[PDB]
Design a protein around this ligand. Structure first.
Ligand SMILES: Nc1ncnc2c1ncn2[C@@H]1O[C@H](COP(=O)(O)OP(=O)(O)O)[C@@H](O)[C@H]1O
Ligand SMILES: Nc1ncnc2c1ncn2[C@@H]1O[C@H](COP(=O)(O)OP(=O)(O)O)[C@@H](O)[C@H]1O
Ligand code: SF4
Ligand code: SF4
Ligand SMILES: [Mg+2]
Ligand SMILES: [Mg+2]
Lengths: 272, 272
């Protein structure tokens, strides 16, 4: 068995930083993990690979002719801790559906046997500002059973969490996609942990971890590394280790209860 | 003649707040303006209408039967300063293309004669995290000749500005869509104005205004108003009046020069 997890959230909220650090901590623990980038920015694996980014399946298929001319060993790359990494890519802005590459990538990985038995986890890093096309496919097509949403006390980030939850509810009659929890990626604001706990309770889930805002993240990323690799003694490294432990141990996977805009505004008013 | 302007940028960056305050200042000046919401959040007109939000063309067409059973007077609503307001709407998350409502709305407004002669400005408030489907239509179909991008020193916000610029370049052979400028919506960080000026110069455009971070915005929005209406003496009100003056006077409309990720990272490193 392997656990298939997807990380969703609004742009810039910390999906790729949180996912790569979480995965590095899992690898440090002895888990075998694959990361599948499903965001057109295509930098979801750079901290594992010590790289600028990673060439995408869409790009490589075009240079090779067809996706069938690609071999899995050409596309998957291993980095820190043996973590395996792949990027979907997507069409250029203004041309075709921004999520089309996700569909091509996941189908390629399935057919080519990337989901081999001794993997323990797969993480999809998915754009969540819209829930449609290839960005909805992990939910619609039952690819990621456990959704974790990165958010913050920012109104827009909480709105995005509610919108992703509505997409999970829409496909609850088929497959087994469920909400696993919220991850608060702090803006360094007072009572922010309590605010995201309250939001999670209203949705029917939990805040799995509160990730502090810490400048060591930027110092690690300037050097193309996770904090786990860059400074294993950092306080922030222990934060990602705690998040990883709680993801491993999590057993609460729910069909969420989306809230109204009045409820969301009341949350923000109350917690000041 | 009327000037057709579209405001793009990443989610949560300040498109709707900046657009509604800019438009209120234009109305205070004596201009006749229409706002067309092109973001599924559908709260792009609430500060003009003193409202929770606005019912969308997609919603109203469904309750009425077809979009042809709607009359323009049923859909357009006037608020502060006589500003006319309409919301496109969009499908629920996980269902169909998130931008589909934009196409329906703009076509409805054109056919029903909303673009009547004594309008001076139309502003489209457009989601910019992806540039595809209905969100690309204002560019692809030559609906907004002047694009203004709201951004900040946030890496993701600058990436979004570069991605929108790539979409403008893609359709430069047809129509007349051009980049009009960047609007910096401050995160209260040092040298941020200089950073966005430098980005604008690299793209070939200009920073049209630096909007400060000011808590009066939240106090006005809790009361469902623009700062222009809520406190006409506020320093922030004069900021939006300066932005409005510069938009009116702007004559620089360019085909932008998108930059590479290395250039974008070098900008951030340099300005610290
Ligand atoms: N806990 C944190 N502390 C400090 N900086 C962070 C933290 N999480 C993310 N960042 C920074 O925020 C920016 C955006 O994070 P990223 O993971 O790229 O967002 P997304 O993938 O959701 O667009 C990056 O520059 C990253 O270094
Ligand atoms: N200059 C500013 N100062 C203070 N708060 C702001 C400013 N601009 C925007 N905001 C706040 O930022 C949040 C997001 O702005 P909004 O216009 O809704 O973003 P978008 O439409 O781009 O998603 C809102 O709560 C708004 O009140
Ligand atoms: S939103 Fe992108 S193509 Fe439908
Ligand atoms: S991205 Fe939304 S439907 Fe294509
Ligand atoms: Mg990312
Ligand atoms: Mg908005």
């Amino acid at each position: 068995a392997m656990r298939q997890c997807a990380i969703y959230g609004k742009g810039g909220i910390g999906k790729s930083t949180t996912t790569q650090n979480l995965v590095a901590a899992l690898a440090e623990m002895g888990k075998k993990v694959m990361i599948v980038g499903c965001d057109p920015k295509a930098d979801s694996t750079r901290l594992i690979l010590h790289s600028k980014a990673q060439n995408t399946i869409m790009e490589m298929a075009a240079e090779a002719g067809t996706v069938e001319d690609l071999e899995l060993e050409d596309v998957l790359k291993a980095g820190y801790g043996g973590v395996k990494c792949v990027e979907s890519g997507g069409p250029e802005p203004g041309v075709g559906c921004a999520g089309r590459g996700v569909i091509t990538a996941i189908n390629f990985l399935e057919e080519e046997g990337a989901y081999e038995d001794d993997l323990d986890f797969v993480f999809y890093d998915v754009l969540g500002d819209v829930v449609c096309g290839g960005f909805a496919m992990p939910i619609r097509e039952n690819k990621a059973q456990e959704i974790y949403i990165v958010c913050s006390g920012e109104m827009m980030a909480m709105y995005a969490a509610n919108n992703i939850s509505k997409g999970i509810v829409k496909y609850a009659n088929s497959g087994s996609v469920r909400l696993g929890g919220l991850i608060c990626n702090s803006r360094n604001t007072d009572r922010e942990d309590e605010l995201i706990i309250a939001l999670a309770n209203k949705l029917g889930t939990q805040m799995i971890h509160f990730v502090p805002r810490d400048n060591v993240v930027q110092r690690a990323e300037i050097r193309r590394m996770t904090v786990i690799e860059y400074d294993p003694k950092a306080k922030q490294a222990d934060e990602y280790r705690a998040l990883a432990r709680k993801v491993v141990d999590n057993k609460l996977l729910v069909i969420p209860n989306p809230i109204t805009m009045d409820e969301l505004e009341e949350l923000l008013m109350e917690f000041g």
